[PDB]
């Protein structure tokens, strides 16, 4: 399972690329 996260991917996890919703940038995280 993946997700958006802010402000970094937490460890564990791999950045795959970025969310823009919300009016923020957010890392994709899985």
Same mark, same amino acid.
């Given at each position: 399972?993946? @997700?958006?996260? /802010?402000?970094?991917? /937490?460890?564990?996890?791999?950045? @795959?690329?970025?969310? /823009? @919703?919300?009016?923020?940038?957010?890392?994709?995280?899985?």
């Amino acid at each position: 399972a993946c @997700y958006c996260r /802010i402000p970094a991917c /937490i460890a564990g996890e791999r950045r @795959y690329g970025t969310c /823009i @919703y919300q009016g923020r940038l957010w890392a994709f995280c899985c």
